[PDB]
Amino acid sequence: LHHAVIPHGKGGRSSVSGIVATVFGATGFLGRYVVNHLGRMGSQVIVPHRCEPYDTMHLRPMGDLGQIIFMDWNGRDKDSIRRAVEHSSVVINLVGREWETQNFDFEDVFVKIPQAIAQVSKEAGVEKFIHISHLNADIKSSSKYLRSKAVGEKEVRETFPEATIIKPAEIFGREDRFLNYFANIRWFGGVPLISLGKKTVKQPVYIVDVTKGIINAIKDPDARGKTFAFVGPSRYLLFDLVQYVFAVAHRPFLPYFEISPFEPWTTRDKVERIHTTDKILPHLPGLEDLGVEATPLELKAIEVLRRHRTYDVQPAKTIP
Amino acid sequence: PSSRGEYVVAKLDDLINWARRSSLWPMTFGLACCAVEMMHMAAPRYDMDRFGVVFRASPRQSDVMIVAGTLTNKMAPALRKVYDQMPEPRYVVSMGSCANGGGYYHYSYSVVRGCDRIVPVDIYVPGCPPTAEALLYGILQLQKKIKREKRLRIWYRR
Amino acid sequence: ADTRPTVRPRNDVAHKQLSAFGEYVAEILPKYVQQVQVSCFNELEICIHPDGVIPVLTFLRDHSNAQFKSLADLTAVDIPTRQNRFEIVYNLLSLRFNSRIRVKTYTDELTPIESSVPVYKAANWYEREIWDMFGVFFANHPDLRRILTDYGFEGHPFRKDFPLSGYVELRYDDEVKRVVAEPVELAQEFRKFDLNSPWEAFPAYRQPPE
Amino acid sequence: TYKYVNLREPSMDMKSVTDRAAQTLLWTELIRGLGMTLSYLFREPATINYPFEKGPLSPRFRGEHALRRYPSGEERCIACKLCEAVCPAQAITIEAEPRADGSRRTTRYDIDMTKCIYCGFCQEACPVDAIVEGPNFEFSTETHEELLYNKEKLLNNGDKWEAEIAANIQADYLYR
Amino acid sequence: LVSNLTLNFGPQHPAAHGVLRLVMELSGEMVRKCDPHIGLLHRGTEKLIEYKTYLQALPYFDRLDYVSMMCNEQAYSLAVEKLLNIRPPPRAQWIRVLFGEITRLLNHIMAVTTHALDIGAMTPFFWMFEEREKMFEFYERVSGARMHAAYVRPGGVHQDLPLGLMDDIYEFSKNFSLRIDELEEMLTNNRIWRNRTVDIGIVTAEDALNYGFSGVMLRGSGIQWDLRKTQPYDVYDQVEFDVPIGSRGDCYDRYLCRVEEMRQSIRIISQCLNKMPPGEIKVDDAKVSPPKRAEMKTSMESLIHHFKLYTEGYQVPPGATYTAIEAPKGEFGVYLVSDGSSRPYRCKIKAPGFAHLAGLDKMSKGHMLADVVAIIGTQDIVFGEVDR
Amino acid sequence: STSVKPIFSRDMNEAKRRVRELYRAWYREVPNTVHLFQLDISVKQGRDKVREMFKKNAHITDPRVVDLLVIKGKMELEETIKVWKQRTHVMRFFHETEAPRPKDFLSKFYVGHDP
Amino acid sequence: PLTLEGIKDRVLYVLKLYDKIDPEKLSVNSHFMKDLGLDSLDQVEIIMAMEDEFGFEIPDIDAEKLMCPQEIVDYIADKKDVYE
Numbered sequence A: 001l002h003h004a005v006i007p008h009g010k011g012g013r014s015s016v017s018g019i020v021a022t023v024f025g026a027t028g029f030l031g032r033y034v035v036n037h038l039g040r041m042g043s044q045v046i047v048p049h050r051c052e053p054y055d056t057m058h059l060r061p062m063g064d065l066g067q068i069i070f071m072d073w074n075g076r077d078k079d080s081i082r083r084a085v086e087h088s089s090v091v092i093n094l095v096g097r098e099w100e101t102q103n104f105d106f107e108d109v110f111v112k113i114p115q116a117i118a119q120v121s122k123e124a125g126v127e128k129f130i131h132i133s134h135l136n137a138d139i140k141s142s143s144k145y146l147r148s149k150a151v152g153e154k155e156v157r158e159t160f161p162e163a164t165i166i167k168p169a170e171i172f173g174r175e176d177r178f179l180n181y182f183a184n185i186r187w188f189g190g191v192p193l194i195s196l197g198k199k200t201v202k203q204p205v206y207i208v209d210v211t212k213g214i215i216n217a218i219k220d221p222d223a224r225g226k227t228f229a230f231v232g233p234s235r236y237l238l239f240d241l242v243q244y245v246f247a248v249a250h251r252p253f254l255p256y257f258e259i260s261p262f263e264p265w266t267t268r269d270k271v272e273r274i275h276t277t278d279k280i281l282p283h284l285p286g287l288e289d290l291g292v293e294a295t296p297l298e299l300k301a302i303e304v305l306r307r308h309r310t311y312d313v314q315p316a317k318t319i320p
Numbered sequence B: 001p002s003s004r005g006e007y008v009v010a011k012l013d014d015l016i017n018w019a020r021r022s023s024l025w026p027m028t029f030g031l032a033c034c035a036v037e038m039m040h041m042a043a044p045r046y047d048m049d050r051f052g053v054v055f056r057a058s059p060r061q062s063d064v065m066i067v068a069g070t071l072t073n074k075m076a077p078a079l080r081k082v083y084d085q086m087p088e089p090r091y092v093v094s095m096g097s098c099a100n101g102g103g104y105y106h107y108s109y110s111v112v113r114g115c116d117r118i119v120p121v122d123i124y125v126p127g128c129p130p131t132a133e134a135l136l137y138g139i140l141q142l143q144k145k146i147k148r149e150k151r152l153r154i155w156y157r158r
Numbered sequence C: 001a002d003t004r005p006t007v008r009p010r011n012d013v014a015h016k017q018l019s020a021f022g023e024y025v026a027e028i029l030p031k032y033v034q035q036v037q038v039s040c041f042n043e044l045e046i047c048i049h050p051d052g053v054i055p056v057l058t059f060l061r062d063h064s065n066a067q068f069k070s071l072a073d074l075t076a077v078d079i080p081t082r083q084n085r086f087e088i089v090y091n092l093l094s095l096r097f098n099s100r101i102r103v104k105t106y107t108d109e110l111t112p113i114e115s116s117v118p119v120y121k122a123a124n125w126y127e128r129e130i131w132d133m134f135g136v137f138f139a140n141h142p143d144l145r146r147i148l149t150d151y152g153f154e155g156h157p158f159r160k161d162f163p164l165s166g167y168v169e170l171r172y173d174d175e176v177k178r179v180v181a182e183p184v185e186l187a188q189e190f191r192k193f194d195l196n197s198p199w200e201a202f203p204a205y206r207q208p209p210e
Numbered sequence D: 001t002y003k004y005v006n007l008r009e010p011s012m013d014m015k016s017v018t019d020r021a022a023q024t025l026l027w028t029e030l031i032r033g034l035g036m037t038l039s040y041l042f043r044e045p046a047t048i049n050y051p052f053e054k055g056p057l058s059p060r061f062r063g064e065h066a067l068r069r070y071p072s073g074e075e076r077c078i079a080c081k082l083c084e085a086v087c088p089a090q091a092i093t094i095e096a097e098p099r100a101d102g103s104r105r106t107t108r109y110d111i112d113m114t115k116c117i118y119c120g121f122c123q124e125a126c127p128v129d130a131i132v133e134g135p136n137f138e139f140s141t142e143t144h145e146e147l148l149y150n151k152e153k154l155l156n157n158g159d160k161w162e163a164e165i166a167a168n169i170q171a172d173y174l175y176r
Numbered sequence E: 001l002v003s004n005l006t007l008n009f010g011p012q013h014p015a016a017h018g019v020l021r022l023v024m025e026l027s028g029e030m031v032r033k034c035d036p037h038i039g040l041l042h043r044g045t046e047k048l049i050e051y052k053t054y055l056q057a058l059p060y061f062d063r064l065d066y067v068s069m070m071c072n073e074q075a076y077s078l079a080v081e082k083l084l085n086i087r088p089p090p091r092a093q094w095i096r097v098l099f100g101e102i103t104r105l106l107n108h109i110m111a112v113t114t115h116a117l118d119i120g121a122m123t124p125f126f127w128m129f130e131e132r133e134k135m136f137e138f139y140e141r142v143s144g145a146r147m148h149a150a151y152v153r154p155g156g157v158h159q160d161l162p163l164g165l166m167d168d169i170y171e172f173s174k175n176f177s178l179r180i181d182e183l184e185e186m187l188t189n190n191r192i193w194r195n196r197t198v199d200i201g202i203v204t205a206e207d208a209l210n211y212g213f214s215g216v217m218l219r220g221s222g223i224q225w226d227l228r229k230t231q232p233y234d235v236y237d238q239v240e241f242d243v244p245i246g247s248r249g250d251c252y253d254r255y256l257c258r259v260e261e262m263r264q265s266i267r268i269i270s271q272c273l274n275k276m277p278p279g280e281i282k283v284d285d286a287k288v289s290p291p292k293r294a295e296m297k298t299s300m301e302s303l304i305h306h307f308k309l310y311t312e313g314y315q316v317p318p319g320a321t322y323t324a325i326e327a328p329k330g331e332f333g334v335y336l337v338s339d340g341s342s343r344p345y346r347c348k349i350k351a352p353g354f355a356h357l358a359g360l361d362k363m364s365k366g367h368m369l370a371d372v373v374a375i376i377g378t379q380d381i382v383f384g385e386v387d388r
Numbered sequence F: 001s002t003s004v005k006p007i008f009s010r011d012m013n014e015a016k017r018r019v020r021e022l023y024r025a026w027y028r029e030v031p032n033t034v035h036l037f038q039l040d041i042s043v044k045q046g047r048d049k050v051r052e053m054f055k056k057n058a059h060i061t062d063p064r065v066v067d068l069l070v071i072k073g074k075m076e077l078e079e080t081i082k083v084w085k086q087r088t089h090v091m092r093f094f095h096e097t098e099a100p101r102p103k104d105f106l107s108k109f110y111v112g113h114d115p
Numbered sequence G: 001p002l003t004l005e006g007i008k009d010r011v012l013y014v015l016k017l018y019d020k021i022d023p024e025k026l027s028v029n030s031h032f033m034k035d036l037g038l039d040s041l042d043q044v045e046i047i048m049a050m051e052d053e054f055g056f057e058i059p060d061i062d063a064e065k066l067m068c069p070q071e072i073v074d075y076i077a078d079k080k081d082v083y084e
């Protein structure tokens, strides 16, 4: 080690942990939680952000004085990546869009950028590289989102062989776009667009468990070079899941929106993914192997959906 | 005429920025002494209203929160409550040593060591208390910070 | 009154009058008064057994030669070396006679003290402050509850053994969307200074050797 | 010696009763209050045109901190730590050692400007006029880290503001 | 208990007194129970003072009643001086009365104008803070700080008055009675103002004393009591002024008392300017007061005393005193205990606002909700001293 | 001596009575608190916490120490019932942000010098 | 209306719900503290169940005595004045 990066303190805010992480995509749903947990234990977080500085203000309270540092970067400019990972020990990558835009398509957010971040990380001496993928990633899947996730996951495993590739399922939480999707898009102005909802089986994982899993992959030395699958305790039927969501939100459920500029809310590919069936890949290690217990949907679903609820609830039925 | 999309976005961005900085309605937590200097910034000599900054703004029409005094542990939940109710865009101005980092009660058991532990802060105004003129300099620094925002220009390149 | 520009003059007539009244109070309430002393700067203190509060405070308020109608203050001092670590101090004011008097008693962590609210309604909040900061319980108090510390605050900060910065500190956590308490960790520890000089400053206050 | 602020007895003659009746019905005092506000509308405003005009200060004003030098250019600070000992807020942190030429000079001088109460005890306690509070009161920052001054910052402030600081000391050192 | 309205001034308005959480039970428009909750500006000041020398603790007293900065300092200095058994020189006693009365004017302008501002009369607030702004310049010229002067210290004052200050104070005092008169042209005889203050929050003389009230809160009810007249402490025995006394014990008499105190303060300030004597400003005793910077750089003894005074501090003989002054808000007193070292063992602060606020429930009984705003204002509550 | 003024109980039997009563008031309250404060815990987790707090003070045998423990517990209840607390104070009992702290020698040995 | 055997039906119904109590060891006379092995704290939880079930308050003095279901049924009867 180096005398600076030796852990000190009691793991709190003003303590030292020796983790010096660059988190790309720190301003997203998954990024805000990772930065939060890295900053509870006194890590040095470099936050490369493309957005306005205003959009990052929520991250500033998450660290002590000096612990969170912000940088500009452009996925196309490699030298902006290098300035971001030059002094780092772990480089976490959470870059993605649920939708394409004019400038970045799914093959640029998921293949060309992650490969560039991984290559510069190798050439800059970085030791640990966390790359996020999807559980349902498949070269033969119709959803273009997942096919890009498959190729990009293939290039990371060649550029940075010692990289930890994490494959979660649909992640649910307060700011998720999974249960918030079933509560809003299905309800307001519409009746569910479920396409044969009885044929889809879903295994969703809580955000904090994914956040915990990512951290322990940094602190666990056997995680290097290993691909993981983070899945919830239970498998649900997509039809029942939507039904259960509605009961929590006290919105009546009756079985049976164009993409646009701004931020497509509901899209062609999103439906193709909400219907893809959560692959079971037993040989891949999961949260069990990182010291995290997957948390039930039922506990952490009233938390997510209490806002939609306007102004005595029965759980869903699991699929063995 | 002829104009690019980049040019249109740059000019619209200047319009909304000019409006947002020209009409800053501040909410003020007058927690302690520093509230007295905030009141002097409203009095005749400096007259913050002449910049377009209204003397009194409700929490749910406010554009900027000015934290003027010591934030104790008993008070911290209420300040975060007010902050969440504020509609965006929202900015926090930390006024004086107490709010900046605890100041002269920094080593107290009942005091938050800086309001940046509770809410994100955009400008820090030093002093114990900062002079009314020193606070006015801080607000004018927030106007320049807003002038440099590029929300639309970023949105175009997304 | 002497031509010593920098030395506070002595008022000896005030010292004599306050000593006469100290005996008067001791003669009238011998059951309770444990000590009477008048300082050099003319301030009478009556020390009493904790059970004489109400009789002693009532006599000073209502007697035609006391008439200490006003409770100027009420506070506790913590002296951990004493067996009764807490000393309760009553500062009273007489407007008829333009005089002040101090009444002191003592207690421990597990001995209640009679509430003086029956005598001075001013003592209601003073005793809530004493309970909150010192953890001294007052019996028969109309409404005893914390007055200064945060809700759910464990401990009594003004005890000499309570650490200056306490044990818990508050921050806002994004994950749980609320203000969370956590064990205190300071980026810069409070630096303790040893300032006492090793040479005696005031012989008049020298204590006899062990 | 005391006076009665409100112990008048209103006169009960008809002339006085009619005066109060006229006041009650014709709103006389209320019109008088409107007169005073009208007079202020035609008085000149006390506002000054900040930042082009500034409020008056004095030489004794306590502002941003700076470390000074002797005319030769050597630092005045000898690392006696009298400022660190006196600082009511414990805002000052000092370390020292013998310099390469054997001089008694600091290697760390820090002021946590967010701890400081701008009381000026440190300049009162300094024996060599090394630490001063300058005339600058316009140095608000966007981040908390920008308000934790190390030795370089305070030396740079002394180099930046020496011209004014020296004149202010010249004006007030006899009072001190 | 028709309804309990938990009124938090958390989203504070332009008052700056602090923040008060008020829990009330409103049986209609009327108020049946009032319960102030006052922990929001509790900063642990009394405990922090135990870790500071006597000099280091003085700035804490600026930040209690932060509209009576130099009056809070004087109370601390009078307490410490009494334990030290020293005397400040005659010139400093006049400077401390002079700035004690400039501070009384500062406090009453805030008290009356923010009281009126809460009851809708916004304009006098701006009229008078142009005057407070000119008073803040006197503070800055003698101390270098507009508010927390740290100027009145045990033994006297830190520095002497700069040349030309007394003329500027006289010029301010010459035009100031007219400023008060304009304020009374807008409030004294105004029927709307009287309807909002007359026979509101009445306090009887007997209940005032038992509840611990002091200052205007007593004199409004007709009690002839002023510490400056009955227990004088600096040169107040050498200045003529009258004490305003109320007759009905309501808000309106308390409003009149404060406005008359501003006039008597200008009367006193006039005498201080004429009677200011020459001499030194701090006790000429270097084991308490620091020596002049010229002597410290020339004399061995002065350098030693300078070195020790700003490190260890002067030791105070063991003892305990209760010292009180007539602060603008009321009787401000400190119970200070010395263990013989250079750091106080215990410093209990007696804030007049602590008792007054505790007496709010008594005063609010049988009044409408909009009156409570008027009752709190007439008490002149600042939560720096309520909580400490 | 052992002659000491009592707070309320004059022997442990009376003290254990007030302890028992105070547990009734807390046991009834948790269902209300979990609703008024909109907590994310189940009423079972809440009632276990009340059991945990009462259990930690089991060894106590001094009648006076028990009176004060009850006095403090009632003040805590009065704050929660009257809703003087806030959602943040009620949830401080659960320490949901503090990370797991080990208790076995090897675990404490790896991280730091704390005993 | 009263049904002394009705009382015993509900009491056993309530105790059957309490998660700690194993149904098998339960008897009309099984001791809470010894046979069942509950703690004093748990005995207070059970009594509170009966107050809800039988719509009245069981005082603390009485609550300590009701140390087994048979005692509960007897005590319930007396306050309801069931003479069966």
Ligand SMILES: NC(=O)C1=CN([C@@H]2O[C@H](COP(=O)(O)OP(=O)(O)OC[C@H]3O[C@@H](n4cnc5c(N)ncnc54)[C@H](OP(=O)(O)O)[C@@H]3O)[C@@H](O)[C@H]2O)C=CC1
Residues within 6 Å of the ligand: A024, A025, A026, A027, A028, A029, A030, A031, A049, A050, A051, A075, A093, A094, A095, A096, A097, A098, A104, A109, A132, A133, A134, A135, A168, A169, A170, A171, A178
């Ligand atoms: N949450 C889920 O359901 C699942 C998520 N994942 C993976 O998790 C990761 C993050 O999840 P989430 O946080 O929900 O994704 P978000 O969309 O919430 O945030 C993604 C981040 O990527 C950044 N970003 C997007 N496009 C670009 C770009 N072209 N150039 C630079 N930065 C860019 C955004 O920054 P800005 O906002 O500044 O554009 C944003 O901070 C993604 O990689 C996703 O594939 C995988 C499986 C399931």
Ligand code: SF4
Residues within 6 Å of the ligand: B032, B033, B034, B035, B068, B069, B070, B095, B096, B097, B098, B099, B103, B104, B127, B128, B129, B130, E063, E066
């Ligand atoms: S920073 Fe200074 S003036 Fe402001 S509240 Fe704190 S002590 Fe008072």
Ligand code: SF4
Residues within 6 Å of the ligand: D086, D087, D088, D089, D090, D091, D092, D111, D115, D116, D117, D118, D119, D120, D121, D122, D123, D133
């Ligand atoms: S001005 Fe006062 S608080 Fe600030 S560094 Fe100097 S001595 Fe310390």
Ligand code: SF4
Residues within 6 Å of the ligand: D076, D077, D078, D079, D080, D081, D082, D083, D084, D094, D125, D126, D127, D128, D129, D130, D131
């Ligand atoms: S700045 Fe002055 S007082 Fe402080 S260490 Fe240097 S020489 Fe000593």
